[PDB]
Amino acid sequence: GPSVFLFPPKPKDTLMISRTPEVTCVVVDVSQEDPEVQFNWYVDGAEVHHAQTKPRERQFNSTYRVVSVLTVTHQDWLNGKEYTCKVSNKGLPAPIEKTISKAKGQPREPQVYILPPPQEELTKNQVSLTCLVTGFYPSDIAVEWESNGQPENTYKTTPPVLDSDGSYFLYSKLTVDKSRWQQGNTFSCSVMHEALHNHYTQKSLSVS
Amino acid sequence: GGPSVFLFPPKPKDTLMISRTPEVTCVVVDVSQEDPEVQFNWYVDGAEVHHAQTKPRERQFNSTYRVVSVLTVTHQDWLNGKEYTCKVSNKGLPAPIEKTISKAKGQPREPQVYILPPPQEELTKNQVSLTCLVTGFYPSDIAVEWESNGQPENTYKTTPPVLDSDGSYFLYSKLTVDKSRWQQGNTFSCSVMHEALHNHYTQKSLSVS
Ligand SMILES: *[C@@H]1O[C@H](CO[C@@H]2O[C@@H](C)[C@@H](O)[C@@H](O)[C@@H]2O)[C@@H](O[C@@H]2O[C@H](CO)[C@@H](O[C@@H]3O[C@H](CO[C@H]4O[C@H](CO)[C@@H](O)[C@H](O)[C@@H]4O[C@@H]4O[C@H](CO)[C@@H](O)[C@H](O)[C@H]4NC(C)=O)[C@@H](O)[C@H](O[C@H]4O[C@H](CO)[C@@H](O)[C@H](O)[C@@H]4O[C@@H]4O[C@H](CO)[C@@H](O)[C@H](O)[C@H]4NC(C)=O)[C@@H]3O)[C@H](O)[C@H]2NC(C)=O)[C@H](O)[C@H]1NC(C)=O
Ligand SMILES: *[C@@H]1O[C@H](CO[C@@H]2O[C@@H](C)[C@@H](O)[C@@H](O)[C@@H]2O)[C@@H](O[C@@H]2O[C@H](CO)[C@@H](O[C@@H]3O[C@H](CO[C@H]4O[C@H](CO)[C@@H](O)[C@H](O)[C@@H]4O[C@@H]4O[C@H](CO)[C@@H](O)[C@H](O)[C@H]4NC(C)=O)[C@@H](O)[C@H](O[C@H]4O[C@H](CO)[C@@H](O)[C@H](O)[C@@H]4O[C@@H]4O[C@H](CO)[C@@H](O)[C@H](O)[C@H]4NC(C)=O)[C@@H]3O)[C@H](O)[C@H]2NC(C)=O)[C@H](O)[C@H]1NC(C)=O
């Protein structure tokens, strides 16, 4: 019957304070005469009550699904206190509790590298760019690219890829133009990953 | 209770060489116990072919039942637009789980392929990375290999297909090799293959040039 799913926030959300990251709790398989639950949290054994819970969001397939937030002061996560959701509903015998904290590991400083494009693209009238990122733990990460001060969106970035050194890697791509590049300017690769001098790093190089 | 059936395609590796024959498979899930087994009444958009090996029932941890249905096929009828089929007759429930699959229809594209050398920042690293980029392709059924002086480089890693711009896709590919052995002039060869490619195969290959 009732199953329970909770989720840690996005890396990008943990790596900047401007958005408090949210450890979230979620429940489906909840019928009607099956009283709503309370989202008892327990941070390492601390009955904190910052929950920005919402009501039961019903479903087409007839499931009173519910949610509830618990934001956290970012630091508690960079060392990952042990968090716990808990269910307070008449229904399944007794509650459901699922601990969650960033997977252990002495993290690693990533290796960011910008790679200018090649000759079979140079010639093409619109050319793309690569910021390889290797050897970092954990895969919890985010990346952006920005064109000389003002940022960008015209870029994509592949979800990570397991790599035999216990550490991950990944790439991205910027579809810049002839107009911008050879006509004098560089571009910047922004890399948010905890274990680094201010986590964020930026790389950049131009015509050379 | 809710007997299900699911259909399956062949890997984008098993349809780019005929040494391998593409495997097409039909999976019967969550049967019932005293239910008799089933019959596989295949087709090919209308051709009840009979070359589909049947393995007797295989129970499942949840004390349930499942079966499978294989298909050795053709690197042709599968790459032109022939919609294959499957069907189970079962005393389970009044049902013929009439199912079909096509090739991922849609216009095939022209995937551009490049190799990228280590960054000036990487250099003084013990081992070394080297990159294969592929962009501008539809569909995403594309395979990748890396090699050197002919020899097969198996020690490589692959970034799964990702979406991009023009409705097309892309994917990068990475390799770690001895910077030492590197500096002594050794070309390295990315080598992809995808549907409507030149002979369904092009590779680029470079080194310290
Ligand atoms: C009735 O309807 C509800 C509501 O959903 C509706 O119907 C479904 C079919 C979809 O069409 C919905 O769009 C639609 O609204 C159904 O509830 C759905 O079904 C089950 C639960 O019943 C859930 O499956 C789990 O999904 C989580 C991932 O959570 C994401 O799931 C979907 C995307 O993957 C997406 O639908 C969800 O919204 C949710 O998306 C996340 O949302 C948060 C919240 O904002 C957001 O922050 C995230 O960014 C976003 N993430 C993504 C990726 O989009 C998944 O984690 C679960 O996998 C675990 O459990 C599996 C078995 O359940 C197991 O096979 C997996 O391997 C994995 O196992 C876990 O593994 C780790 C490590 O090994 C371990 O620590 C865990 O303990 C272990 N867990 C277990 C159990 O083993 C799982 O797949 C759906 O998410 C859920 N969707 C919603 C919206 O509630 C319901 O099923 C319907 N019933 C019927 C009969 O149809
Ligand atoms: C009782 O047990 C059985 C047996 O399960 C087994 O035993 C348990 C105890 C555990 O050990 C399990 O780990 C183990 O599987 C249960 O039977 C299962 O039933 C579920 C349905 O609820 C099936 O889920 C399907 O999942 C496939 C995903 O494809 C991969 O899934 C598995 C990942 O490991 C893998 O086992 C599968 O084989 C398959 O992986 C590929 O398999 C082929 C084999 O033919 C192999 O050659 C490949 O190499 C292998 N590759 C990889 C990478 O694994 C999925 O296709 C189905 O999802 C469809 O439907 C979902 C909604 O139900 C939807 O969310 C999905 O997106 C997808 O939707 C389809 O999407 C396509 C394209 O977008 C669209 O065209 C379709 O219209 C659309 N259809 C629908 C309906 O949405 C499906 O969910 C399990 O595969 C199956 N397992 C087995 C072994 O049979 C049974 O559920 C148990 N009962 C209970 C109550 O728990």
Residue A194 belongs to domain with CATH number: 2.60.40.10
What is the spatial distance between Cα B120 and Cα A208, in angstroms, rounded to a whole number?
11
| A42 and A106 inside one domain | no
Structural domains of chain B, count:
2
Nearest-CA residue for atom 71 of ligand 1: A5
Answer for the pair A145, A156: CB distance below 8 angstroms, yes or no.
no
Both A76 and A108 in a single domain?
no
In the chain, the amino acid numbered A49 is H
B112 touches chain A (CB under 8 A): yes
Last residue of a domain, one of A101, A118, A149: A101
- Quote the tokens at residue B148: 């050197």
Q: Which of A3, A4, A5 to mutate to test the pocket of ligand 1 (most atoms within 8 A of CB)?
A: A5
Nearest to A108 by CA among A158, A164, A159, A168: A168
CA distance linking residue A189 with residue B82, whole number of Å: 45
Looking at the structure, do residues A84 and A151 belong to the same domain, yes or no?
Answer: no
**HSE on the CB side for B111, CA within 13 Å?**
36
In a shared domain, residues B132 and B192: yes
- Other C-beta atoms closer than 10 Å to the C-beta of A135 total 17
- Give the domain extent around B13: 3-102
**Do A6 and A94 fall within a single domain?**
yes
Residue nearest to atom 88 of ligand 2 (CA): B29
Q: Which ligand does the CA of B30 lie closest to?
A: 2
The Cα B165–Cα B159 span in angstroms is 18
Mutate to test the pocket of ligand 2, among B62, B71, B84 (most ligand atoms within 8 A of CB): B62
B196: its two tokens = 């409507």
Q: Single out the residue in B102, B118, B139 at which a domain terminates.
A: B102
Among A101, A123, A149, identify where a domain stops.
Answer: A101
Q: Which two tokens stand for residue A189?
A: 């690769």
What are residue B97's DSSP bridge partners?
Answer: none
Tokens of B133: 């980029």
Domain match, A19 and A80 both: yes
* B69 & B55 share domain: yes
Specify the resolution in Å. Answer: 3.5
Same domain, A130 and A46: no
Helix (H, G, I), strand (E, B) or coil at B188: strand
Q: What was the experiment behind these coordinates?
A: X-ray
Shared domain for B59 and B115, answered yes or no, is no
Phi, psi (5° rounding) for residue A35?
-40, 145
Say whether both A112 and A196 belong to one domain: yes
Q: Is A11 helix (H, G, I), strand (E, B) or coil?
A: helix
Together in a domain, A122 and A147: yes
DSSP conformation class of A64: -
Q: Which two tokens stand for residue A67?
A: 């949610």
Same domain, yes or no: B7 and B33: yes
Which two structure tokens, joined as six digits, stand for B105? 């229809």
